[PDB]
Amino acid sequence: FEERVVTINRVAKVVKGGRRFRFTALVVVGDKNGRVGFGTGKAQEVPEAIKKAVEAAKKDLVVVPRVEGTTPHTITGRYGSGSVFMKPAAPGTGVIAGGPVRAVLELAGITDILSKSLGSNTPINMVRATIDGLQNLKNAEDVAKLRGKTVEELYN
RNA sequence: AUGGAGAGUUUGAUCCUGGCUCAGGAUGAACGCUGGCGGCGUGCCUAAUACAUGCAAGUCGAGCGAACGGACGAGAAG
């Protein structure tokens, strides 16, 4: 699994002595073949935080439906105030996405997509919104099975 | 399906709300520095301010009278 460090944040807890600092890492994990995960890890040192995040991301991996390097249908993934619109694109379009979304889509093995972050730009909520969208993605075969029709009948 | 990227900044730290700021494209542009050439364009946006000088509306003799020019070529031998 490829691993990309989306953000590293120095967080502080106030004690009598003063502020105690730890580092938080947000990491996306993917095989670049329809499985992607995200995890957060916190530690006094950044390498240890990254490592914990990688282990967390591997624990939660989501299967993404892909139609020839794009998504099956347009979707708006929403989590909290985070909102990400993702529209399927033709080959050679490239990944048109910003910041956290790019990492998630690339590691999921999506090479062509149109995306816009419509909500919060906070990295974690953008990632969760993106994952939500991918989770609500559906494939024609499953829709056909659920609706008791052939894929051809689905499209008429 | 031919088409859609975000970032910084309120806190000890946080999530949110929210404004501010930036990365792009464009111009009858101006200014600074610099400057080889060619092709094709563009060039008073302001004082519908005032304007020296030349030029930008004439033509027709197959409408007309008249005037000039007087060829060709009429006479005398100084």
Side-chain angles (χ1 to χ4, degrees), chain A residues 27-155:
Chain A
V27 165
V28 170
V29 151
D31 60 355
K32 294 195 169 185
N33 202 62
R35 281 163 62 238
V36 73
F38 86 92
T40 56
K42 208 180 313 178
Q44 303 285 355
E45 283 148 293
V46 281
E48 307 163 1
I50 291 177
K51 202 175 309 173
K52 293 178 191 180
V54 166
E55 302 319 303
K58 283 171 160 51
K59 287 174 59 179
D60 186 6
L61 290 168
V62 313
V63 174
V64 183
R66 297 178 303 160
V67 180
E68 300 182 0
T70 199
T71 55
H73 57 87
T74 185
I75 192 75
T76 301
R78 296 179 171 240
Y79 188 93
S81 312
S83 185
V84 179
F85 160 92
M86 286 164 293
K87 175 186 174 300
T93 293
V95 176
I96 319 303
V101 183
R102 177 180 290 291
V104 177
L105 299 180
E106 286 181 2
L107 284 190
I110 301 162
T111 55
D112 302 292
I113 195 76
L114 299 165
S115 171
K116 182 59 180 178
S117 182
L118 300 165
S120 295
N121 64 299
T122 302
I124 184 172
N125 291 303
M126 275 183 68
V127 165
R128 290 171 174 289
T130 307
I131 294 288
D132 173 62
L134 298 182
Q135 286 181 301
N136 315 309
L137 283 174
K138 313 147 64 67
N139 62 70
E141 294 76 2
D142 291 0
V143 177
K145 290 166 187 176
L146 249 51
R147 281 169 58 186
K149 285 188 155 48
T150 314
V151 176
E152 312 294 354
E153 294 173 358
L154 215 75
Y155 300 143

